[PDB]
Each structure stands twice: as C-alpha cells, then as structure tokens.
Symmetry: D3
Subunit: 218 residues, 6 copies
C-alpha cells in the first residue's frame, strides 16, 4: 500500500476513509456488554493498523511495540471525533452517549473530563473527516516506544504521513494546529490506559489482551 505514498494524496485520504473501522454498538449497559465492546475495539484497532500504508513494512516486533504505545490514542481519537457534533457528551458507541455523570457511573472514573478537554480542543478547530484520518494515522506513526528496534523505518513512516498531511492542506498554520493537539491526545490515552490497568477487567491486563490479538492478526 506504499504506492499510495507515491501517488496523489486524494487516493490515500480515500483509502483511509475506507479502512475506518465499522461503527460499533454497545447494546446503563451491563459491564459484560461494555467488556464485549472493549474486546471488539481491540480487534478493530489492529485490523485497521494493518491497513495503514507503511505499517506492515515494519517488522512484527516493531509493529507490536508501535501498537502497544499508541492503540489507545487511536481509540480515544475515534471517540473524540464522533463527539465533535455533541455538547458535554461522549459517543463511546453508536448507541452509547454519556455525559460526565454517565461516564463515571458507567465505571470510567474521571476519564470523562479528560476526554471532553480533548474534544473541546478538536472542536475549536472544525476538525474535518479527512484531517481526522490523516491525524489518526500520523498519531500511530508517531510512536515513541522504547522497544522499537528499527527507528529509521518508524521515522520514515511518520515523515510520509506528515508529508501526506501537508499535501492535503496544500491543494501552513492549519497542519500545525492539528499536531498541537497531539500532546493532549497522548496524555488522555495514558490516563485511559492506566484506568483499565487498575480495573484489570476479568483478570486481564490490557497489554496481555492486545498482544494475543496482535498475534492472531500477525
């Protein structure tokens, strides 16, 4: 899929819109149902990552290390986009919209406040559907994992996705305004991750679940 880096950006952007995960439903929900949602959020994030141009050109160890470090940034950014046309509320699924009271009552502690701060930041910018999928693929390529063996290759992927974002905005402040929301994206994803490490849902460390599903898809 690296031919998409060689061609014009429009076909890359459209590929990214087509590889967007299928909208997920939760079916107030019981924890069993939220656990099922989480499980499918993991599978979906992995199959998506495999369809990012360049990602599969990294070795399996670096593909895993990259995903461990940023898989929750991909999810959080998904939740944040779907929540832009909303006010003080978060779209955790197609049939699950929760304010800060419903977030904490659904068992997410104080993550609502952290996620809404990220939403407001993206809302202050009129984040387009096309930018969102360029920003999301770039957040994945911007991994800073200490476990990465081939750094050059990861750097190359990120430069290409950076270029792609510049080539989109071309045909200069706009590109940077989106990148400047990335520090908060990482910080908010670390908070979500730390929450679910603490919960340890059904006896399972999130890291341990991600590795096994990455192993199935790799």
């Amino acid at each position: 899929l690296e031919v998409l880096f060689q061609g014009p950006v429009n076909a890359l952007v459209s590929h990214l819109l087509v590889v967007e995960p299928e909208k997920l439903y939760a079916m107030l929900p019981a924890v069993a149902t939220l656990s099922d949602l989480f499980d499918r959020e993991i599978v979906v994030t992995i199959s998506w990552a495999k369809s990012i141009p360049g990602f599969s050109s990294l070795s399996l160890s670096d593909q895993m290390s990259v995903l461990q470090s940023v898989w929750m940034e991909v999810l959080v950014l998904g939740v944040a986009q779907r929540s832009l046309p909303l006010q003080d509320e978060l779209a955790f699924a197609e049939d699950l919209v929760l304010d800060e009271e419903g977030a904490r009552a659904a068992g997410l502690g104080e993550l609502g406040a952290a996620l809404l701060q990220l939403v407001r930041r993206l809302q202050a910018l009129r984040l387009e559907r096309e930018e969102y999928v360029l920003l999301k693929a770039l957040a994945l390529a911007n991994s800073d994992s200490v476990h990465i063996e081939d750094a050059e290759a990861v750097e190359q992927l990120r430069e290409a996705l950076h270029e792609a974002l510049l080539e989109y905005e071309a045909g200069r402040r706009r590109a940077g305004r989106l990148l400047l929301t990335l520090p908060l994206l990482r910080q908010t994803a670390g908070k979500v991750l730390a929450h679910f490490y603490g919960v340890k849902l059904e006896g399972k460390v999130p890291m341990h679940k991600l590795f096994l599903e990455m192993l199935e898809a790799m």
Copy 2:
C-alpha cells in the same frame, strides 16, 4: 512585550535567547545540594515565563494554571537541549553530567531512559538554539489545564507563538517535525513530575512549592 508579535521574528527570537535562565551549577552531589538546584530551577522557570511575550497578559489564575501544567516540560526541554551534543548522558547542570547509571544512582529512578528517548528525538532533527527557544515558549502556551478560565486568551498566545515559529522557518515540514516531539515532551515531564510527587522532598509537594514561588513573583 507584545510589540514583539507585531514586528519581524528576529527581534522576538533574540529576546527569547536573551531571557534564557542563567546557567545553573549543582556543586555524587549530596541530596541537599540537588534539593537546592531544584529550588533554583523552579525560581528561574517562573521569571522566564514572566518574560514570555503574551504570558503576563493572562489573569494571575490562568498564569498559575498554565505554569503548573507545563513548568516541568520547560525544565525537561532545557535539560534535553544541553544534552544534544552528548551521547547516552544528560546535562542536569553545568557541572552535572550523568549517564543512565548515574541518573538512577542520583535518585531519579528510571527517568534517565525517558529523558534520553526525548534527547534522541531532538538529536534526530539537528535542533537549533533558535528553534529550541521558540518550541519552549510554544510548549508553555500549549497548556491544557482544566483550571484555565480564559481559553480564548491562551489559544491566542499559542497561535502567535505558532505563527512566530512558522515565520522563523520561512525566512514546510520543519516546523511540524519540531511539533511532533511535543507529545513525548509532555509524557516525559509527567513521569518526572510523578517521580518528585512520590519522593516529596523535605515534606513538600512540588505543586505547593511552585504556587508559593509563583505567588512571590506575581
């Protein structure tokens, strides 16, 4: 000092180079003397922020909230800059250069690894002194404190410093490459901050030390 935003970028950049904190010595060093260093690092980070064009024109409450959230990012970025012409070592002071073994022996736990990861990232870019002081003022203005009242006024400061960094690079990928290191900068400063919260050196919470010093300078 906002007359520096309406002029040519050269006068702003040299002003930022002029308001850099005075080089700090530690005088292997005893904790007492490292405590003293930390105490002086706090003081100089505050007087420096006071000299950032725009900052002083926020309300005192927003100035404190901004600094609490990013004061350690400003510190960490200082340390990483002075470490660019080094290999696997960190310049914590003019007379304190420690490798990862020395970092952990001096009582910084595993932060050495976290700080080197950030150093490498800045080294893979040939980061220049002028880019550094613009990135540093932009890190301060990119605060995401939940305690911020006037978000429009913070955004405005952030935009002007973003513009100023764009105007520096003008006279397209360069500015964005520097911005893409900001998420790791936030993450690394959060680790450092959490370290010192847990240490609670001399019975004192770093937050409680910062506020009192901010008080005196405001």
Copy 3:
C-alpha cells in the same frame, strides 16, 4: 480584628459565631451536585479564614500554607458539630444526612466510620456552640505546615486563640478535653483529603482548586 484579642473574650466569641459560614444545601444527589457543594465548601472556608482575628496579619504565603494544611480540618469539624444531635449519621449538608451506608454509596469510601469516630469523641463532651468556634479557629492557627516562613507569627496567633479559649472557660480540664480531640481531627481530615486526591474530581487536584480560590480572595 486584633482588637478582639485586646478586649473581653465575649465579643471575640460573638464575632466567631457571626463569621460562621452560611448553612449550605446539596439538593441520592448526583455527583455534579456534590461537586457543586464541594466547590462552595472551599469558597466559604476561605472567606471564613480571612475573618479570623490575626490570620490576615500573616503574609499571603503563610496564609496559603496555613490554609492548605488545615482547610479540611475546618470542614470536617463543621460536619462533626452539625452531627452531634444525631445518631450514627452525618450532616454533610442541611438537606443531606447520611449513615455509613449512604456515605459509602454517595462515594466517600470508608470516610463515614472515620467521621463518626470524631463525632462520638465530641459527643462524649457536650461540645457547646461557643467552644466549637473557639476550637475551630484554634485548629486553623495550629497548622504545622513545612512551608511556613514566619513561624513566630503563626505561634503568636495560636497562643492568642489558646488564651481566648482559656478566658472563655474561666468566666481547667475542660479546655484540654477539647484539645485532646485535635489529633483525631487532623487524622480524619488527612483521610478525607487523601480520598479526594484519589478521586481527582473532574480532573482537579483539591490543592490546585484551593490555591486558585485563595488567590481570588487574596
């Protein structure tokens, strides 16, 4: 208001009864409503402290340090007094009376047990309205903050409030019986504070909220 230290104690005691915070209502309550209550508990504790004779004669840094260390002892003691005419229940607001089951179900963990132990201690003494306001002003002046610069001045304030309590009980075991409940008051307030640090309600460290409101009133 230090003229109240020079005159007879009766006018000091009546001043303390008049500067007592206005009774607060919660309106089983949603967390948003409990968060609102907490926010107003902070504002109210600050304006009260400013009306304690002597407190404003300390420098702003010592006023803040003193309040950080004891603001929750002031609140806890408020809750405890209002709960003396009750049995195994706590008056958290005018319209919020909770037993140990309602305390834990309102999200206070096991703080109910800690607060009821303090209540029983004060109940075993028939704590008068007048003693309560002398004991409360004395708990504030008895701060042991490591951040206090002018210790002598804090010591002076506490000696005066101690005298005032002795001058009240005069016109010797009675005064000490009240002071001997102070260790448990501090311990119970530390527990409450540690709870709310853990909760980190809406992304906010209690310390960080107190400093900003102290900044508004100072």
Copy 4:
C-alpha cells in the same frame, strides 16, 4: 499501680521516669543491625505500656488495640525528646545521630523532615523530662482505635493522666501548649508507620510483629 492516681503527682512522675525504656544502642550501620534495633524498640514499648498505671486494667483486646494505634507515637516521641538538645539532627539511638541527609541515606525516605518539624515544635516549649513522660503516657491513653470495646475505660485512663498532667503543672497555658503538639505527633507517627508498612522489612508487616510480641507479654 492505680494507687499512684490517688496519691500526690510526685510519686507518679518519678515512677514514669523509672519505667522509661533502657537506653538503646544501634552499633552507616547495616540494615540487619537497624532491623535489630527496631525489633528491640517494639519489645521495650510493650513492657513500658504494661507499666503505665491504668493500662494493664483494660481487657487484653483493648490493650492491643490501644498499642497498635499509638505504639509509633510513643517511639517517635522518645526520638524527638532525645533530639531536643540537637540542631537539625535526630537521635535514633545512643550511637546514632543523623541529619536529614543521613536519615534518607539510612533508608527512612523523607521522614527526617517530618520528625524535625515535631522536634522544633517541642523545642519551642523548653519541654522538660517530667512533662515528656506525662505527655507520653497521655498519648498512649488518647488512642482512637475503632477496635476499642470499652471506650469508657479508655476515657477514664485518659482523664486521670490529663488530671495528673494538670496537677503536675499546678504544683494555665502550659498543659495546653503540650497538648497542642499531639496532632503533629499522630501525623508524624502515621507517616513513619506507613513507611515501614511499605518497606515490609524481612517480609514482615509491623502490625504482625507488634501483635506477636504483645501476645508474649500478655
């Protein structure tokens, strides 16, 4: 030994001075030898409590509950007393005097600061050996354990020791000034206790060590 409560205070005070634990040496010291010291500190605190007039006349369950809650207050107060004629240093043993740098190097974290704050407080009072041993027996009797069955019987012990301290000072502000240092004593002992719980020296919870030794002496 309750015949000492019906007589003149002089016979009680000299009895308290006589039942002081024998001065302890540590023999910079290795952890093994500091572990040995701690082990002996526990033993002597128990035999001392056994010799407090009143204590032995509680049920065994209330004696254990009382000691668990305040055994470290008794220890800490010993250390602070022996440190009164010192400056910025603590007498942990007859042959172990450590400043704050030595305290942290010997593995006590930041407790040195907490203990010095308490020392200063006792030093600002010209605390006398006779006042010290009365305050110490009164700290023990001021327990607030949730596990206490006979609260009336604990209260009675506490009242008698309060009275005895009043009768000592008689033959008005002096007794109250000593009582006002008790909240910091509790707070400091809780910090020390939490330190050693987290260390869990040789696999052993301090609570579990105290109970077994209390068992042997009961």
Copy 5:
C-alpha cells in the same frame, strides 16, 4: 485430637466433616449485611481451625501466624466447593449466589474471575466432599508464614495431614491432582485479601480483626 492421626483415616475424615462450619446466610444485600457476613466468616474460620487435629499443639504465636497466612485460603476454598454444582456463579452464602456481574456489583472488584478460575480447576476433578475437607485442613497446615517459630512442628502437622490424604485415596495421581490446585488457591486468596485491605471496611484492617478474634478464642 491427635488420636485421630493414630487411628484409621475414616474417623479423621468424619471428624473433619463434623467440624465443618455451619452454613451461613447473608440476608443486592446492603454492605452492613455483607460486613456482618464477613465478621461471622472470621469467627467461624477460627473455631474450625481449633478443631483441626494437631493445630492446637502448636504454640499460640504459631497458631496465629499460621492462621494469618491462610485464613482466606480456607474461606475461598469453602466458597469454591459450594460453587462446584454451579455454572459461572459463586455461592458466597446460602442465600447469595452471584455471577461475575453480581460479584463486581456487590463490591468485589474483579475477584469473581479469580474465584471462578479456581472453581473450574476443582470442577475438572470431581472434588469429593471428603477430599475437600482433607485438602482444606492440609492448606492450613501448609502455611509458609515468616513469623513461624517452631517450623518442625508445623512441618509435622502438614506431613500427617498429607499422609491422611494418601491413606484416604488408598483404601497415586489423584492426591497430587488436588495438591496441584493449591498454588492457585493461595494466589486467589492473596487477591481477596489485598482487595479487603484496600477497602478497609469500617476503618478496619482485616489482619487487626483476625488477631482480636483469635485472641478471644485463644
């Protein structure tokens, strides 16, 4: 009761079935009611332990140390047996059967998953009522407490209970298949114990409650 070690195993096994704790009811339940259940689970485990042949032949200090280390393994194994004839559910009391959703909603965090893993292990073996009571008495005698003074005596008790289990299965893989579930039993009991340490129900450390009740029965 060591005559039961000298006679034939059938009388030992029948003694163990007769000293089994009386079935407990909870009466979805309020926490007060679950707290009452817990309190009675402690009393019952202690009186049971005193009726294990050999246990009382250990000194009081070793009886306590042994019980502290394994009392929750005894409870957990009780819960697990009663749950063998169930599917994905746990019998916490006679009138309390909860699945993983009801376990977490009753306030047990993720202990349901840990307890069901232990149940499945015991179910894969058709654990008999007679084996269960031999396995339970052997888990108690298999204590690995660092506080045990007379190790030989504890070792002797465990060897006898091991023999007894071999003499039962005689009149070789069967005995070991049961012993191989013991590592998971300890691990699951440590998890339960750590949960209740964190909860600190009504201000009480489980260890501190067990010691006082052991003191009543000893």
Copy 6:
C-alpha cells in the same frame, strides 16, 4: 519430543537435565550488568520452554499465555536450586552470591527474605537435581492463565509431567512433598514480578519484554 512421554522416565529426565539453560555469569555489580543478566535470563527461559516435551504442541497464543504466567516461577526455582548448598545466601548468578543485606543493596527490596523462605522449604527435603527438573517442567505446565484457550491441552501436558514425576519416584509421600512447595513458589515469583513491574527497568515492562522475545523464538 512427545516420544519421551511414551518411553521410560530415564530418557525424559536426562533430556530435562540436558536442556537446562547454560550457567549464567553477572560480572556490587552495576545495574547495567544486572540489566544484561535479566535480559539473558528471559532469553534462556524461552528456549528452555521450547524444549519441554508437550509445550511446543500448544498454539502460539497458549504458549505465550503459559509463559507469561510462570516464566518467573521457572527463574526463581533455578535460583533456589543453586542456593540449596548455601546458608542465608542466594546464587543469583555463578559469580553473584548475596545474603539478604546484599540482595536489598543490589536493589531487590525485601525479595531476599521471600526467596530464602522458598530455599529453606526446598532444603528441608533434600531436593535432588532430577526432582528439580521435573518439578520445574511441572510448574510450567501448571499455569493458570485466564488467557488460555485450550485448557484440555494444558491439563494433558500437566498430567503427563505429573505422571512422569510419579514414575520417577516409583523406580508415596515424596512426590506430594515436592508439590506442596509450589504454592510458595508461585507467591514468591509474583512478589519478584511485582518488584520489577514497579522498577520498570529502562522504561520497559517485563511483560512487554517477554512477549517480544517470545515472538522472536516463535
């Protein structure tokens, strides 16, 4: 290698003795060099497991899940075996023998106590080299990972290794005495594992290191 399960136990035992990891040297040692040792311990534990008859015939996901849960049990048991002919000391490497004081100074906290308790337990049995390698392969097969798909296939491996240990002891209490040390082995390895999770050496979670190395060898 399952042809070793259908033959006489002698060929299996000598195969287990042959696939023992090559003796490891550390070269008081610097953390860097202890980090290097740990890195090599992980590698050899993986290649060893690959050589356990049965293991390689699980799916890759079950192989990883099994190893994650018991890799540290395998390590710990190695260290305890090499420590049998020592007193109050542990052989962490061929050139690293540390007592409890040295263990804590080398940065292992209080794990020395936990490991010696396990050593004593194995020493009270005259544990032989042949029993050790069978117990070690059986510890691996006794995994209780919640992530295990094919529980029947793990059970089968476990049964065969149990049988093999029974067949070794044949050619009745001996096998069971070795199995009764497994609960302490799990508990001790969990403590060690939790230590290194908290240390997070060089920014790396042990789980994340194991998975990547497992990846390479699979």
